[PDB]
Amino acid sequence: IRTLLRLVPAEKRGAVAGYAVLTLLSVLLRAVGAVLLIPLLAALFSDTPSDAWLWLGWLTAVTLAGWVTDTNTARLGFDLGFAVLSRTQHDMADRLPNVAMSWFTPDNTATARQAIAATGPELAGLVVNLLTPLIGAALLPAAIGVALLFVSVPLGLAALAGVAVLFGALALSGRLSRAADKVAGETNSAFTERIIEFARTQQALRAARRVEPARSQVGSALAAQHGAGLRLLTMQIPGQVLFSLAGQVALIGFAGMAVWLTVRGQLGVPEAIALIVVLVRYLEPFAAIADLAPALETTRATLNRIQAVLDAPTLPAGRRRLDRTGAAPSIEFDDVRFSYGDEVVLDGVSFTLRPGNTTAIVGPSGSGKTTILSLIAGLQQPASGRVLLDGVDVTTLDPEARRAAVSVVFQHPYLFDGTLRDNVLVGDPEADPDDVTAAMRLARVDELLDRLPDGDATVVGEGGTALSGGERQRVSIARALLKPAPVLLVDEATSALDNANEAAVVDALTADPRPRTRVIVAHRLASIRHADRVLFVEAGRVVEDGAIDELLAAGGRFAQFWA
């Protein structure tokens, strides 16, 4: 139960204490109500059945108290379950944008997906569906045994000795099926990720002919998942048998001692008959625990995933802010070094970019120029060195001010499932319609509206798959230009645009009225006409820099690059 208390909100610990008190009280009332039968039949079968009214009057009060506390326990269990659901999901939602970009490995991306996908009803009603009946079932035979000490001390000892084997079976059942359940969970998660890949990469798989189950990766994941699933069913048989034998052993112990006391005469005959009913109430939890134990293993796996996402390392931050009210800041790399894993992407790159001027970045493929834009934007952070905006290191910047100071046109223009205007408004949702129309006009997106049938309401698919590559690219450009940030990083914003649209967008990037520091990555010389400066980023090093005409006349790497 420790993992749940860790996930409980600090606000909600008071309810958890109240819930735990009522859960124990409910179990005591259940056991006392069961054991009150033994006096009841002793009086009822006697020569004075009027004595049974006392125990019936007490049994009624214990029963109503059982009803009231069980409804309240359900209420508190419901509130605790959803309060944990809302708080953990909100914590993951807030943490994930701050988690380091390198954390999103394919395994970690899967784990984050299933943790978010656990928002459904199975986790919300976790307390009422799983914890409450489990605590009831586990503690009921103990409460019956403690109650039976009043009726007969050695009888209570026998009842509690049955609880010893109950917990013994419960402990061993987990270890028997732990390995199989872990393998089953892993294969299921792989199957989920391959289905998502199957639906996303459908065109490439179809052309590559790896789409049939006999040939596809998803088909192998399904076969492995089926095999792991059958193994889990097989490996749960020891658990079921163990609980069944534990129930039979407790039956033998309880019944054997009851018969021994009955034959010895220390325990009455009608009381011995009542113990049959109490024994059945005593053995019901032995079956309930068996039904609930597999759900515990799945829940432990689920909460491990949620805590793993909440254990992710957030990117470093601070509280610094730029003095400027969105005026153009200078950008400079103070001997920056950065490496994905173990490979050096940047090796001591150093430059200073003026406040209002436009800078171009060019060079061979795989050089590391999106990494430079990512570092300027704070998506990454340097391994060593310090990236400054207007003299303020980005690592110390307030995350709110850090993202408000940069706007990016990404190399692969992802778009969110929704209308076209929603994706443009993501740049600045509070923007005026005049500002939105200007932004879409600048990005040539007005041509899309006057050519697509629905206009700006054209529903985009997952990603930007319901739009052409150039069309989703122009939507991303519109999104970035809408934002009023004073640093605009243009990462191949005209890769998927024809010459006419490429020329129009390139003019619009410089015709934007407000002053910004513009960093442009390009593999088309016609796309960097307006740049005041160039940086030839090759092999992680700025091999040369200067003006376009200056470098072209110099005949260095730049002239060979655009031969």
Added chain:
Amino acid sequence: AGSRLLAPLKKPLIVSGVLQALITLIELAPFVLLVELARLLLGGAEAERLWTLGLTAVSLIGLGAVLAAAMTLWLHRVDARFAHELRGRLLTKLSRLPLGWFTRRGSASTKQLVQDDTLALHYLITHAIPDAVAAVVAPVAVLVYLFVADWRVALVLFIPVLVYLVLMSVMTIQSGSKIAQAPRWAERMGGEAGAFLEGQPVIRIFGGAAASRFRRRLDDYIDFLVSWQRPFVGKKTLMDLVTRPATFLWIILVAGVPLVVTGRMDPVNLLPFLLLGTTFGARLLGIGYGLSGIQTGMLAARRIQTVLDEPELVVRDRTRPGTVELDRVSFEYRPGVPVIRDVTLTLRPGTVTALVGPSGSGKSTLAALVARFHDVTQGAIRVDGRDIRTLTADELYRRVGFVLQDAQLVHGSVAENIALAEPDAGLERIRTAARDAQIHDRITRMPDGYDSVLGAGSALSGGERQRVTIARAILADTPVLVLDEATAFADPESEYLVQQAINRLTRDRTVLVIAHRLHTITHADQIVVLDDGRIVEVGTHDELLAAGGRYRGLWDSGR
């Protein structure tokens, strides 16, 4: 709809019904013996009779547990095997549906369908029929026994039963609509979660966590769950109180004690109610909690069979080489929204056809139709004279290779990604294909070499992963190639080298090149200018420039 899907489980489900009837009668038999044991135990019978009844009762309890365990084991194996077969059928179905089905549906909704809908069938096809038959047989058998014993105290057992039935009916009525809305809400939240994790750089730059749409819809979904679950769980626990054995035991005594205190009953005849009357409540709770599971299972069956009933890309029986031939092709993704209009285009062996034009004109759709990811609304497309609708996926894709606009890399080693089209290709073939695509050098720099994994988060640069897909298409080595915007993210030096490698390989092949870098396609034997979904002009580079048409405009704008 559901029954047409679950027809193969006719005989297991009928066998489950009858086996549960016998098993639940066997499970009730011990308490009948215990009543007999209790009656003789008050009568002071011989020890042999008491031991015989007691030992038999314990043995029948063991037998009931063994048979119940064997049943649920077998029935769960049957459910597991059916689900594997059903998932296999869905994957085979999705392998031949039109590709617009995926685009309008999304990957999240596909994930719910293949994995979570087949899992939602669980309670219907392994738990529902046992739970219903147990709740029908055992309460009836118990109440018939107790009405034989005493009608006065057997009648009061209708009070918890009637209250349970009323709670069960109003519960199902109240939660019926929400259970129908639930699967679409899960699809929506699955879509938001997938976009939130995939589109993280957009979230980090533009608005952060709080401004994200995911948090808005996450609050909406949790608000839906609360409204669905609070009254549902409230009813669900009231039934638990009503049908609890303690409730039956109390109300039995409330009805029995005033009789026994009076001369209206013998306490020996209260033994059946205490022993039998308390036991059938838990079996009513089965379907009491299972109606929601059956409703969800039926809806999941309807969704699964609806997709399995979806129209697909058939392979007709109607039944030069290397030629591709579009004959008045027209195509629309949405009805009433044309994107190709009356396009005629013949690609011949030993030629390069450059398909240029404005962005969004329809070039990538025309490449897709050559792939038969969709079917044309009009006209025909013929490969080697064989219409593509008469060709299986094997025969069609044996003949046409593709480099797609998006560099989609599957989760796996780099050799797997290059060998996607031919997994059994030798490593030497893979290295030669990577050397041609100018990506072998980068692969040797990677830590593990070719075995290094290309899952998201261990990805490559944009131009590099594009060169991997070009390496994939070169390894397929089909008679026809379709280069849908290769070298878009490549630098001029890499772009020149890979184009030289392509122009070396495809001298005796048909090539369709979609390029916005018009300077790369000037060598094409035919340059097709696709504007507004219709070919506006055709010719060589020099002819198009002299004509002063749309190509001249694009060429001038490129300078």
